[PDB]
Amino acid sequence: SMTSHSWLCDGRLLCLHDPSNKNNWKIFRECWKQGQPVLVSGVHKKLKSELWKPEAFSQEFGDQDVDLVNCRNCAIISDVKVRDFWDGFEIICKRLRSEDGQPMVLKLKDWPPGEDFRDMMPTRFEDLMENLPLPEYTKRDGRLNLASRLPSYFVRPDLGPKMYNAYGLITAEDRRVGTTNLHLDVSDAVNVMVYVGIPIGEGAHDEEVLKTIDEGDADEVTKERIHDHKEKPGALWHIYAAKDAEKIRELLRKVGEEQGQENPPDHDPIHDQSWYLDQTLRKRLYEEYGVQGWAIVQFLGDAVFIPAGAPHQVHNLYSCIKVAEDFVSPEHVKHCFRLT
Ligand SMILES: Cn1nc(CO)cc1-c1ccccc1
Ligand SMILES: [Cl-]
Ligand SMILES: [Cl-]
Ligand SMILES: [Cl-]
Ligand SMILES: [Cl-]
Ligand SMILES: [Mn+2]
């Protein structure tokens, strides 16, 4: 039957079922005050689906100049066209090939550039902002968003939203690679999965996706959403509590040293955005430092709420279009304060 919510991560993750339920705040605010991420499903059913397709972005913006990133080695592909990314998003026979003749796994960098989303894409901007869940927290002028109400003693978010556009990781070797490496944000954010592209040509890449979720430590109920309801899984997240950030820095300093990196005792491996915690590193974090995380599979139309200060990493399973908006909740304003 229809229900207001359910739980993932063995009861540790709230999943809200109705993105426009005017009573969601009553369930949300207790989990949020405790420093937990939250998932909201069904946002895709509220959007104009024709605005969020890879073919539309190619047709409308394809002649713009852009840089790409190669996800396998972090190398920059300089001064190519927006269409060189979008036309290979699902059709593997159209992707830029590395010099080994394999199709590359690419990310579109800084697009739209800086704060230009609203000017470049006004119809998309309105469609996203009017359908965000928890609107008192997430709208630019929400009653519980302090972004526009704080003095310069607080770090304020840039004007959003921001897009995260990248191909899926494919091979067994790619299982230990990040789409986006471990980092943290001093603002809160909501990240919405607006499109999942399941490729063709080299399409039938279903079994390595299940091994990735299993080794990723996904709970048994999360595994039922694949096998039972057939929704499209986009990306595997690991999120850690803001309180655990220093213990994670202690682990990554120790591993940097073991691997022959030469680093001052105080350098910040989270701010560096150079690490992806693979199954080996995640087990070491739990066993050596006592730190547990949240393993989250983000399906089409899932909104992931990411607490200010919480370290997080993302591994795309298929090609994904995500759009995120920053906000400043009262529960987490301490994380952006510039003193003590
Ligand atoms: C309207 N609606 N739609 C869904 C999606 O499955 C869930 C609900 C919901 C809202 C309040 C109480 C119970 C359920
Ligand atoms: Cl907090
Ligand atoms: Cl638009
Ligand atoms: Cl709300
Ligand atoms: Cl990154
Ligand atoms: Mn982030």
Is there a binding annotation on residue 185? Answer: yes
Instruction: Specify the DSSP element, H or E, that contains 116.
Output: none
Closest-approaching ligand to the CA atom of 229? 1
Side-chain-side CA neighbours of 199 within 13 Å: the count stands at: 29
User: Using an 8 Å Cβ cutoff, are 17 and 42 in contact?
Assistant: yes
User: Using an 8 Å Cβ cutoff, are 228 and 85 in contact?
Assistant: no
293 vs 35, 117, 224, 282, 324, CA distance in Å?
12, 32, 20, 9, 21
Sign of CA dihedral 225, 231, 236, 240: negative
Instruction: Specify the DSSP element, H or E, that contains 280.
Output: helix 279-289
Number of domains in the chain: 1
94 vs 84, 107, 316, CA distance in Å?
8, 15, 19
Distance, CA 56 to ligand 3 centroid (Å)?
A: 10
Is there a binding annotation on residue 271? Answer: no
Bridging pattern class, strands 188-197 and 233-239:
unpaired
Torsion, Cα 248 254 255 257, to 10 degrees, reads: 140
Distance, CA 17 to ligand 5 centroid (Å)?
A: 30
Strand partners, 298: 235
Three-class DSSP labels, 184-227: CCCCEEEEEEEEEECCECCCCCCHHHHHHHHHCCCCHHHHHHHH
Q: Which two tokens stand for residue 215?
A: 């080794």
User: Using an 8 Å Cβ cutoff, are 191 and 39 in contact?
Assistant: no
User: Using an 8 Å Cβ cutoff, are 55 and 311 in contact?
Assistant: no
Is there a binding annotation on residue 315? Answer: no
- Ligand 1 nearest-atom number relative to CA 23: 11
Ligand 1: which residues within 6 Å by Cβ? 2-4, 17-18, 21, 42
- Indicate which residue's Cα is closest to atom 1 of ligand 1: 18
335: left (phi over 0), alpha (psi -120 to 50) or beta: alpha
Query: Coil, strand or helix: which one is 232?
Result: coil
- Indicate which residue's Cα is closest to atom 3 of ligand 1: 18
Looking up tokens 């909740």, which residue turns up?
A: 329
Range of the domain at 161: 1-340
117 vs 78, 112, 121, 268, 323, CA distance in Å?
21, 6, 6, 31, 10
Distance, CA 52 to ligand 3 centroid (Å)?
A: 10
Looking up tokens 């979720």, which residue turns up?
A: 213
Distance, CA 226 to ligand 1 centroid (Å)?
A: 21
- Indicate which residue's Cα is closest to atom 10 of ligand 1: 4
Looking up tokens 């840089």, which residue turns up?
A: 67
CATH code at position 98? 2.60.120.650
Nearest residue to 191 via CA among 313, 330, 108: 313
24: Cβ contacts below 8 Å, ≥ 6 apart: 16, 18, 40, 133, 134
Closest-approaching ligand to the CA atom of 190? 6
Closest-approaching ligand to the CA atom of 74? 5
Instruction: Specify the DSSP element, H or E, that contains 101.
Output: none
- Indicate which residue's Cα is closest to atom 9 of ligand 1: 4
What 4-13 contacts at long range (C-beta under 8 Å, 24+ apart), as own/partner pairs, is 6/221, 7/221, 8/39, 8/219, 8/221, 8/222, 8/296, 9/219, 9/222, 9/294, 9/295, 9/296, 10/219, 12/36, 12/294, 13/37, 13/38, 13/39, 13/294, 13/296
Which of 4, 5, 26 has most ligand 1 atoms within 8 Å of CB, for mutation?
A: 4
Strand partners, 236: 297, 315
- Indicate which residue's Cα is closest to atom 4 of ligand 1: 18
Cα 244 to Cα 25: distance, rounded to the nearest angstrom: 26
Which of 1, 5, 21, 44 has most ligand 1 atoms within 8 Å of CB, for mutation?
A: 21
Interior/surface letters 4-19, b for 16+ CB within 10 angstroms, e for the rest: ebeebbeeebbbbebb
